[PDB]
Design a protein around this ligand. Structure first.
Ligand SMILES: CCCCCCCCCCCCCC(=O)O
Ligand SMILES: CCCCCCCCCCCCCC(=O)O
Ligand SMILES: CCCCCCCCCCCCCC(=O)O
Ligand SMILES: CCCCCCCCCCCCCC(=O)O
Lengths: 240, 278, 242, 52, 278, 193, 52, 240, 240
């Protein structure tokens, strides 16, 4: 009856929103565990359960007048966080989906629109091949410099092919996306490869009913979903 | 016979486009098909019949020219190695990234599983590049990663005991051969958000997925060439599976092994002086 | 030997041939196909997905801002917001969208198109808008009185943020030409006009932003198709990539 | 097919051993446009208001 | 028809690799799969599932690229006789020992029973070995042991009343023909620990099994050649039976008719400075 | 099973390259051996039966097993840790780090030999045999095998204080190869006469 | 075979009289690895101790 | 038929011994998960599985002529090791059993006997109340100073009431003990409380058939078994 | 119950060993007589029975510190011995299998390992083609000069593909191999061709618990099995 009110409970953690639009389920595919027919790695996976399948909140971002956008690689952004981070550090290979929740509230006296992209295999470039601090920026995420080109020589306008929602401040204060695992192989290393990029790009700029511009943060909350890990060894934190 | 029935697959392109049902006028507060909410990320559900009064239209148009098979299922140039007369040897690194038309067509998808038909046209010419007569056999050898490469025209690597080779004539019909899906992965990847190596984050190994790279084609003439030979390598993609559509490439390609673009003027479509006139 | 007569077309290579050909690795056994989400079997599944029009193509607008048509408080009645020639080819705003970029690969098109508009003003900002589609034969409609004579929707800004104007397939022929090739007079295939007008006005509370935006979005309806593959005009190269 | 209208009907005959040798597939395969157009948990029927 | 059914053999490559069953932890004194004894000469019987906790894996990989047929079933160079213009005649002694890639592949087995497809590519060139134009028929004559050999281009031996011959054009398609298993023995032998003759132990007849030797191919042009011709002789081994696998050749080959090697530095793999680092 | 040319230290020639030294240690938790898991290249696995077959192929999949045989006197005792470390990092530096991986612990006794099964642990269904640099086939890095003293080698007075391990390797039944390719080290500069 | 997975299914058609003319055989034949891996008079089951 | 040959496979890890005595299963109780009737904590436990239920090898100890003995607290000794250590750090409370394997080989030319005690609730004292470096010594373990009194004012002779084995060098080179969880409550904190102490005490001294005394190490290998964790928060490493 | 104790009875001769490993039966093929379907020679074979199918002991070899290995051709090594030797001399062609028993005992105070290869069709070479005194060395056998290359440009490490056992002195004092006839024809001359080579190569050198090195012989005992002979003429002893 109301797809404007949602509650998301994973593990010991629960999100609510009174202004959602709906929930985007990418490609209509809920995250799912790997079947014996597609699996190759012969060791028995570790499935950590609620210790890792829970919402984690990243540090907030201020939405400024000039903001071009922000992005996070997954699992990259959560590789140093909690028991997800530890399971990803201690295993050679990892698989799983995501529950992404972007929060940004403002007033009925504000206007502005965010585009919230989950982009699979979002390889990035500009006039130059990017360094590690941009390809794998960590929990703090990176920023766009070519938001029009979607950092990749394509166009932002056509990125609605990717799973997305909007945050249009007159309508909603939050976007929710459920992401299945996407890859060309069954499992893959968490430190060497980013399967998804969460991208939040301002399209209509942020305007206030006065010239005094109070602080309007954007906040990202991400839960891993249906995770497996194989290849247990020592903990390795980054591909460097 | 049934055994020959195994080598025949009856396959049909008869999927039609959607039709149109007649509709009449609607004056109500019940049904509001035109009111939408793009914030959800869903595309509009409103149809013709619910927005205006329509007639009935029986569907007659096919969709098969935009099936992924038909869209990729033709040959395109992917390699143009030149065999000079000094060494009479050349090679082409095997990937679909030197020539932009096929690469841009592939950029509509993330993962692609296919077979390949390769077609090789050899052309002989003079130093001033004017067509000339030269009848000679040439050899194309598939050299997979880790096999030693030939260094000369007479290298004993061209024995080809384990590398597959094709021998054809420069002035004969074009060599042609098919190839199954060869990736160690379960699909190829058009784009890769990762590193080619552990313990390394060099920019030159970002976006490099080495499971797309199946090695080299090497080319010699069986004798020393009298004139230079140009091989044109065509690939037709067939038996095609495609996953995860993308925003297609819009900026021109600049490099073979990464997505770098100029991005000096942020626009794609042309400009006008006023939004309310053409 | 069986007597034969090879005929014309012997030994030619046609790029669209559909022939079996010997496999250079006849014993190879590929990796299994695994499940991957989002399998695409036909590019018209992509064409039915909405994408954003590069609609604010005015000289001097760069970057993300080309995606927001300005909408303001008017001081005069029945003013025009936007004008757009309905064309899948050429280089105007539709040409860079998902549907437009697919049309770059094809020569002919048929079917209905829909345009979804999303208002981005404040919650308190009101307005009513007229979106018109004019079938071909003449020019762009000059005033809202002339535009209303065509197919049109009237949009009330409110809780449901977005509207659809369905541009229905209205056409003398079953198919049109994508391109506007002059030497070949493909203007024969002129497909009409889309215009946007203030139906009442944009109204704001005191001291609110007097300018807001429409984000235009376009996609194909399920009755749409393309024919004749053709080369994309703007995907070129002057040298082999290294 | 010596013609129904827009129905191309083909007998692909592969003369070689490996399936990869066969010519291109002419089947039309299932289209599920809604995994991309309606990728949402709650279906929104056309006649309803989307939000709420 | 059933008679045509006789000329068709439906043959299938669908053998899979072994799968994996899930296993759990084992704490016992009953079952010790990891304890082995290499002294028996048996290979270890321990499997994945008994050493660690495994998941279930459905087998999906084929084995057919390592079937003996597939491993040998491609063409390789085995002879490269050069026909000069002085006599316009040449020959090749028939065995697979001039070129090392096929010989080393055969060295994995002791006895081998097969058929052969031969393929001959002729190439004309100048004295400086640059490709040149020459259209001429050539003749390849099988000369079995005891048949008189041609001594000239016009020798009346080329009549070929009882020796089989193939006639083909230098600038035409390659000559190709098949051959059944021809040994007087019930297999060929890759290695022979004996003497070619009774009442003789000359080192030059050690390791020589003359039942591997079926004679000669002789080559002329049907007129006197204007330019030298190089024939490349390719053999593909087919319908293959193999017995008794061996330690494969590791040292380079040195001679055509014996296994002599250098053996100056006794090692095969490369060295490092320390066994506990790379 | 075939014998690894495992003692590939510079200066060891001939049959002795087949015996890894094992000694009485004067310090705890020492390392016996280290080996990069690779079917290609030119390290010790490359000259074995499995390695020489891999020279003819481009790609591989499946589990491998390594069987070790101790050659000390009847009276010589010891316990050994054999570790397999999945890829992502370097060779394990100490026995504490190596034990975190797949590993077996070997007690010298009547049953002379042990198996460490190196299971197929892999992001993909297949790996590349070669380590081709230009093509970045190090992407296919397959991990590490290391051997450690779990306790020590202990001897009666005046016995040989050095003994040997003969390492042996073979493929499991879940193993396969793809794409024939030319063998690198089987060459010729002239036609054989 | 217009495709099951790793099953190549071939109709070898020989046009000539002699069986030696036929193309190469695509059958997978029986594998008895144990004549080489377990070449011993007394079977040693995996869970047993080998000696004694 | 032979309780002198054993193999223990947990996770990706396998132990063997050709001179075991048997396996001691303390109080005849194999480790087991907590039932709904005895449980109190309402959150759903994380059960890490093979990522933690595996053998870990501690650093070896030299058996010297003067050695009084060694001891390790559990879970204390493994609290900084592997995914067991991480799951124990990130949760307030923990429960589980142990698989303990003590290795010490010597020759038929040696004599000497080790006593291998698993002591539950082994609170220790001497002439003084002990400091933290002795109550919770970590992975390196502690050493006895009053081996006769079992560090606790009782006697070593009566400690055969505790689950134990011997390592008598003429007979065996290894001891194996399976330990159930023991506590007066269902779960308990891993950093605040040690449920078991592994104690290895020389009883008959180590003697060699010569006067030259080669190095004879003792090596401890411990696998957690049937583990659960509740109370997920940040990771806390020690009770200090 | 014990594959460490064996007894081999052929003819009037019986071998025993109390430290065997098992018995290797090459290619799982017990020696067998030639069937009418594979036979070509039309004369009725002589089958001598127990007069030839019996164990023969060759002269022993000292295992020295520097020993590279030893080898014997079969039937070559037995062509001048007993009624086997006489039946092989008097017939043009011969067929049969072998029962090979290598003996080498040492002490529990010794270490060292012999590899015992039965190599079919073992054609040999070095930097030069070998002379008759090496290709057919007789009852005394020959010695390796390139044991690493297995006298044939292959490698000793890969010769485990051949039927083999080890003699590891800590484990066993004897190796037993049963060899079927192997050839590419049904029968073949005993003086012109050697079907098998028995090769005994030291891999781990022989070490003693003192520096005084007592004599440790190696002893070969070979029984022909399932023999047939055709082509009776005068007796011919060698191919010279
Ligand atoms: C010559 C026979 C074997 C050659 C294998 C060719 C297979 C080519 C597939 C290329 C797929 C990746 C395309 C790309 O990386 O851009
Ligand atoms: C050499 C054997 C002859 C078999 C070929 C018969 C003709 C090919 C079948 C083509 C089937 C589709 C043609 C069509 O109806 O459009
Ligand atoms: C030209 C027709 C008859 C020629 C017969 C060719 C048969 C060749 C088989 C060679 C087998 C032995 C190989 C070798 O000795 O190395
Ligand atoms: C001239 C008579 C035509 C007969 C040939 C029919 C096609 C050859 C059969 C090929 C069978 C295997 C093909 C496959 O299914 O992969």
């Amino acid at each position: 009856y109301s797809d404007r009110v949602a509650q998301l409970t994973l593990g010991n953690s629960t999100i609510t929103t009174q202004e959602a639009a709906n929930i985007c389920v990418a490609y209509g595919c809920w995250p799912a565990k790997l079947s014996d027919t597609d699996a190759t790695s012969v060791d028995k996976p570790t499935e950590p359960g609620v210790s890792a399948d829970r919402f984690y909140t990243l540090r907030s971002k201020p939405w400024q007048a000039d903001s071009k956008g922000w992005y996070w690689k997954l699992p990259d952004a959560l590789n140093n966080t909690g028991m997800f981070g530890q399971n990803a550090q201690f295993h050679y290979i990892y698989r799983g989906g995501w529950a992404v929740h972007v929060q940004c509230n403002a007033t009925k006296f504000h206007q502005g629109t965010l585009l919230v992209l989950a982009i699979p295999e979002h390889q990035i470039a500009t006039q130059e091949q990017p360094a590690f601090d941009r390809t794998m920026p960590g929990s703090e995420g990176g920023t766009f410099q070519e938001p029009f080109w979607l950092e990749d020589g394509t166009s932002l306008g056509n990125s609605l092919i990717y799973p997305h929602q909007w945050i249009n401040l007159r309508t909603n204060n939050s976007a929710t996306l459920i992401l299945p695992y996407v890859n060309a192989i069954p499992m893959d290393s968490a430190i060497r490869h980013s399967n998804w990029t969460l991208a939040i790009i301002p399209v209509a700029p942020l305007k206030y009913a006065a010239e005094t511009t109070p602080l309007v943060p954007i906040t990202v909350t991400i839960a891993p979903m249906e995770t497996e890990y194989n290849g247990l060894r020592r903990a390795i934190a980054s591909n460097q | 016979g049934k055994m020959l029935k195994d080598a025949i697959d009856k396959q049909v392109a008869g999927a039609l486009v959607a039709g149109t049902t007649t509709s009449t006028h609607s004056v109500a507060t019940d049904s509001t098909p035109a009111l939408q909410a793009a914030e959800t990320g869903a595309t509009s559900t409103a149809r013709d019949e619910s927005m205006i009064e329509t007639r009935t239209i029986v569907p007659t148009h096919g969709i098969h020219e935009t099936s992924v098979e038909s869209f990729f299922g033709r040959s395109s140039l992917v390699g143009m190695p030149l065999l000079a007369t000094g060494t009479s040897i050349t090679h082409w690194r095997i990937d679909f990234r030197e020539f932009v038309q096929l690469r841009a067509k592939m950029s509509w998808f993330t993962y692609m599983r296919f077979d390949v038909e390769f077609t090789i046209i050899a052309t002989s010419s003079t130093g001033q590049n004017v067509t000339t007569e030269q009848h000679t056999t040439y050899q194309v050898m598939y050299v997979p990663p880790g096999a030693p490469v030939p260094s000369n025209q007479d290298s004993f690597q061209w024995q080809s005991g384990c590398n597959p080779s094709v021998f054809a004539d420069t002035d004969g019909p074009p060599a042609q051969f098919s190839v199954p899906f060869m990736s160690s992965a379960n699909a190829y990847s058009t784009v890769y958000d990762g590193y080619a190596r552990f313990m390394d984050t060099d920019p030159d190994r970002y976006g490099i997925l080495p499971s797309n790279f199946l090695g080299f084609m090497y080319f010699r003439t069986l004798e020393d060439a009298a004139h230079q030979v140009r091989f044109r390598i065509y690939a037709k993609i067939k038996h095609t599976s495609c996953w995860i559509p993308r925003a297609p490439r819009q900026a021109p390609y600049k490099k073979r092994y990464n997505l770098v673009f100029s991005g000096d003027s942020d626009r794609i479509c042309s400009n006008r002086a006023s939004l309310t006139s053409y | 030997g069986l007597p034969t007569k090879p005929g014309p077309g012997s030994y030619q290579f046609m790029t669209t041939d559909e022939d079996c050909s010997p496999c250079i690795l006849p014993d190879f056994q590929p990796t299994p196909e695994i499940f991957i989400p989002g399998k695409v079997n036909n590019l018209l599944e992509i064409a039915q997905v909405e994408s954003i029009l590069e609609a604010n193509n005015r000289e001097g607008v760069e970057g993300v801002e080309r995606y927001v048509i300005p909408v303001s408080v008017q001081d005069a009645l029945d003013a025009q917001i936007y004008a757009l020639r309905l064309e899948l080819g050429g280089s105007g705003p539709l040409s860079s969208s998902l549907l437009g970029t697919l049309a770059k690969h094809y020569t002919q098109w048929s079917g209905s198109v829909e345009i979804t508009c999303m208002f981005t003003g404040t919650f308190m900002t009101t307005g009513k808008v007229l979106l018109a589609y004019t079938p071909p034969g003449g020019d762009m409609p000059r005033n809202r009185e002339e535009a209303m004579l065509g197919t049109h929707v009237i949009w009330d800004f409110g809780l449901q943020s977005s509207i659809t104007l369905v541009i229905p397939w209205i056409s003398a022929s079953h198919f049109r030409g994508v391109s506007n090739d002059d030497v070949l007079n493909y203007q024969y295939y002129a497909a009409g006009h889309v215009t946007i007008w203030y139906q009442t006005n944009m109204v704001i509370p005191p001291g609110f932003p007097n300018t807001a935006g429409i984000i235009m979005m376009i996609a194909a309806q399920p009755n749409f198709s393309f024919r004749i593959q053709k080369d994309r005009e703007d995907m070129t190269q002057t040298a082999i990539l290294q | 097919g010596a013609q129904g209208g827009s129905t191309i009907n083909y007998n692909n005959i592969n003369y070689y051993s490996h399936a990869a040798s066969a010519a291109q597939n002419k089947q039309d395969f299932t289209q599920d446009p809604s995994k991309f157009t309606q990728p949402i948990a709650d279906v929104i029927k056309e006649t309803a208001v989307p939000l709420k």
